[PDB]
Amino acid sequence: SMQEEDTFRELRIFLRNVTHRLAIDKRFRVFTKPVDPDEVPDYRTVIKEPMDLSSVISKIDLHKYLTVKDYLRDIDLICSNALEYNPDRDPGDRLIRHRACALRDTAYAIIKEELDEDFEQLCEEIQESR
């Protein structure tokens, strides 16, 4: 229905706003673009499904997300990829892991504050019906 298409348009507006607020935070610069294959040739042999905030924006516009649960799987993948690729005790790896955990925690906190649980439930029931 037209009303269901309006629901998914409001979801996209909400997800673009959350993603922009993450992408402008200085702590999260390393997560804003894909890893450069020239500077890190081993990245795509270790990490099987790369993800970053520019690709998340592209996916919103391609209508890949029908629920906030769908979106948070990709935020969780940005964080888990960083923890997997950078697991050592040295300061550069510990700084990237701290920032990845802060990206995940910040996204979940904005959603807890600003997503209506009945809006999410409506998106999930339309998705289930298709």
Ligand SMILES: COC(=O)c1ccc(NC(=O)C(F)(F)F)cc1
């Ligand atoms: C999400 O970002 C990453 O997981 C990540 C980014 C860069 C590098 N490495 C270099 O820049 C290098 F090789 F030049 F030291 C390692 C991991």
